[PDB]
């Protein structure tokens, strides 16, 4: 009665592009070209696929299958599998809030850059502005110029002193106050995601049509543009030059594993929610396969889109694209690439489509990012929730805005690094390992192959059973152990993070998954009788 069965998706292509749009984001565009260039060049293509075939694809497919089979949220699905691990469904929620605290602000920057890209003369071309210093030296000026340790470029000046305004803060210690411009930008973004989420999967399935197809068009325009630029072969050479001695280093394998894990994004509850709304007899294998393989291919061509332009930039300057692509962060897009676009014909066009591309790269992923949590909460508190969806979605968008006010400060970029590298990563990897173990070693892999055999009509191959049993948990275990054994020393804009930053990162990191052990203790302490009977009634799913 009343609700009973849940709703279903409006078309196969909508869900196929929704998952693709969530999988593809900023990092696919710029993190993969950098990590591919600095870790063996073209030879990075070899371990990147292995970590996919053995690690990424099995987690992606197993998550999309569990989601499309059980049709439950990230929280209520554990009550029907392993109640003690229900805290997982909560942990991810908290995790999402941290991601949403910064991932949108980044887009805000692009948005503030987009609304600043409608002028006939781009603001970051000249030095006669209200934010430039006396060190600002630009081009279209007297030739012979020689760069100095204190000299700066109008683009670097525009990012540093105008939009980001990071010169007004001394670090994590002093970062206040808040920039109202980026607050309004992130409000507009939280509004464009509000009207794209508030109705449920109908609008995020209609809006995804645009958010997921535009980046390929923009990447195509930038691609055929950058291929025509003189001296673009240098960036391609630096992008594909095989350096097989890097493969001897045990670091590049960990870099590839981590990169393909985030980029694929299993273990977050997004694929669970997206798979939940679908036909029971609908095929899941082909969907997961195609989407992931596209997500990789798209990264691969994005590499060219970036390195052709950076090759042209190295030609205009003096070569060694590694020198011009030293900084691995937002500065590679907001300063370097932007300065390269400004020196091209129809600069307004390629700027509008570039920043618009960035925003459209981000939107689909935060759409999903919220979609998983909303689905989880609505499925965990039914009839206490779902009274309206707009109320909860609004409470989340607003919560993310107040959670992003720390990032909208002058030293907000500092917090972005802190949140992006020390907090979300190791916790998502941790909960992904816990989930992979619970589904593989608690619920039983044989019964899982039986559920896929019921849904798809055939039992999964031995390659996948042997992947879920041993290969995938060791795949996540390797990354977690590698990170925990040596957290990277953070540095951003000639500013090294204090030594206690990692403690703050761990505090944010630890505060996310306090619920899974405290919930195991909660259910283990609430259910009467012996601990063996409590863990037996707590590990085995509900019989009816």
């Amino acid at each position: 009665g009343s609700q009973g069965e849940r709703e279903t998706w409006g078309k196969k292509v909508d869900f196929l592009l929704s998952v693709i749009g969530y999988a593809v984001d900023l990092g696919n565009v710029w993190r993969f070209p950098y990590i591919c260039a600095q870790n063996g060049g073209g030879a990075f293509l070899l371990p990147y696929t292995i970590m996919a075939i053995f690690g990424g694809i099995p987690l992606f497919y197993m998550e999309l299958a569990l989601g499309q089979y059980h049709r439950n949220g990230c929280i209520s699905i554990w009550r029907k599998i392993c109640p003690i691990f229900k805290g997982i469904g909560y942990a991810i929620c908290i995790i999402a809030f941290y991601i949403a605290s910064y991932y949108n602000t980044i887009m805000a920057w692009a948005l503030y850059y987009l609304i600043s890209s409608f002028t006939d003369q781009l603001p970051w071309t000249s030095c006669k502005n209200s934010w430039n210093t006396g060190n600002c030296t630009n081009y279209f000026s007297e030739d012979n110029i020689t760069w100095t340790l204190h000299s700066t470029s109008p683009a670097e000046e525009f990012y540093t002193r105008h939009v980001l305004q990071i010169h007004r803060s001394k670090g994590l210690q002093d970062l206040g106050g808040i920039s109202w411009q980026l607050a309004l930008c992130i409000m507009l973004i939280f509004t464009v995601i509000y009207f794209s989420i508030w109705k449920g999967v109908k609008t995020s399935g209609k809006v995804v049509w645009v958010t997921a197809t535009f980046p390929y068009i923009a990447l195509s325009v930038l691609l055929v543009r950058g291929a025509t630029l003189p001296g673009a072969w240098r960036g391609v050479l630096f992008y594909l030059k095989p350096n097989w001695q890097k493969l001897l280093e045990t670091g590049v394998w960990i870099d590839a594993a981590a990169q393909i894990f985030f980029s694929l994004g299993p273990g977050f509850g997004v694929l669970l929610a997206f798979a939940s709304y679908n036909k029971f007899n609908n095929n899941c294998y082909q969907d997961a396969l195609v989407t992931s393989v596209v997500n990789c291919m798209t990264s691969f061509v994005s590499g060219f889109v970036i390195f052709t332009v950076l090759g042209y930039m190295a030609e205009m300057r003096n070569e060694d694209v590694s020198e011009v692509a030293k900084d691995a962060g937002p500065s590679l897009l907001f300063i370097t690439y932007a300065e390269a676009i400004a020196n091209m014909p129809a600069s307004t066009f390629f700027a509008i489509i570039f920043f618009l591309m960035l925003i459209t790269l981000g939107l689909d992923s935060s759409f999903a990012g919220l979609e998983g949590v909303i689905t989880a909460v609505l499925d965990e508190f039914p009839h206490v929730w779902a009274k309206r969806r707009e109320r909860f979605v609004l409470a989340v968008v607003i919560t993310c805005f107040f959670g992003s006010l720390v990032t909208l400060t002058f030293g907000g970029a500092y917090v972005v690094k802190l949140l992006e590298e020390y907090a979300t990563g190791p916790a998502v990897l941790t909960v992904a390992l816990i989930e992979a173990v619970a589904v593989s070693w608690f619920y039983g892999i044989t019964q899982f192959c039986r559920d896929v055999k019921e849904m798809l009509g055939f039992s999964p191959g031995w390659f996948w059973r042997i992947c879920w049993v041993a290969i995938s948990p060791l795949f996540l275990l390797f990354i977690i152990a590698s990170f925990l054994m040596s957290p990277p020393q953070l540095r951003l804009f000639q500013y090294n993070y204090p030594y206690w930053s990692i403690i703050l990162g761990y505090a944010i990191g630890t505060s996310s998954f306090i619920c899974i052990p405290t919930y195991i203790a909660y259910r283990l302490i609430i259910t009467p009788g012996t601990f063996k009977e409590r863990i037996i009634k707590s590990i085995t799913p509900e019989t009816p």
């Epitope: 020689t146 340790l149 003096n318 060694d320």
Partner: antibody
Framework: EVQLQQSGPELVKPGASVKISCKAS????????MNWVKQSHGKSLEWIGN????????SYNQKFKGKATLTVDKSSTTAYMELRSLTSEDSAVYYC????????????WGQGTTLTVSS | DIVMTQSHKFMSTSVGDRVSITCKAS??????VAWYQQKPGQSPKLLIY???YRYTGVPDRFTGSGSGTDFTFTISSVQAEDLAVYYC?????????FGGGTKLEIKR
């Protein structure tokens, strides 16, 4: 004008260490990278590494990693290079030369330091 | 790394003749080549930077040409005080390497 005055010649026994100074004048010391070029007897020039005077931002060569240590002092605008584990190959003339960030040319050099590693 | 190869270790010329020294690089360099002059007993002195551009305080008789991998340093009127060892050096990729050196001996 722009003058880079190094230290005098040094005769040191093999296995010891030696430090060479580089007093700069005639320009804004905090504006340019400070470099060190090794020139062997009858050989070509060999860039050892540079250092950023503002914070001591060193950048050595893979061939000199663990061989040379570059330091800098802003209070007196003077650079230093220390060499440990001295052998017969280190007996050469060392220069310290000023250089901008881009284009990376060596506009002004020091007079040189004749190093002799022998017992 | 980059290998700056000066094939001619020694070159003979006369006072007033046109002399040109060649410099061969490993990979493509665009226009990132500097020419230094080291007189016997003195420190190297920068003459050319970025292939063709002359530095301040350098006579007009010293020129530079080339665009790619092979570069040429040209002296129009050789003087008696031009007797020195000439070095070429790339300034694009880390590390910065030098050439073998061409001791320009004067024939009379």
């Amino acid at each position: 004008e722009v003058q880079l005055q190094q230290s005098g010649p040094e005769l040191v026994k093999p296995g010891a260490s030696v430090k060479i100074s580089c007093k700069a004048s005639g320009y804004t010391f905090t504006d340019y990278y400070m470099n060190w070029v090794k020139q062997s007897h009858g050989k070509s020039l060999e860039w050892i590494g540079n250092i950023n005077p503002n914070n001591g931002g060193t950048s050595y060569n893979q061939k000199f990693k663990g061989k040379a240590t570059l330091t800098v002092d802003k209070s007196s605008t003077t650079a230093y290079m220390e060499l440990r584990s001295l052998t017969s190959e280190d007996s050469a003339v060392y220069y310290c030369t000023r250089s901008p960030v881009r284009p990376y040319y060596f506009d002004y050099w020091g007079q040189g330091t004749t190093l002799t590693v022998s017992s | 790394d980059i290998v700056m190869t000066q094939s001619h270790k020694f070159m003979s010329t006369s006072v007033g003749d046109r002399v040109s020294i060649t410099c061969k690089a490993s990979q493509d360099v665009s226009t990132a080549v500097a020419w230094y002059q080291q007189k016997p007993g003195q420190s190297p002195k920068l003459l050319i930077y970025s292939a063709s551009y002359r530095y301040t305080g350098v006579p007009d008789r010293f020129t530079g040409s080339g665009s790619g991998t092979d570069f040429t340093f040209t002296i129009s009127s050789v003087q008696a005080e031009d007797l020195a060892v000439y070095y070429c050096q790339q300034h694009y990729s880390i590390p910065r390497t030098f050439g073998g050196g061409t001791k320009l001996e004067i024939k009379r």
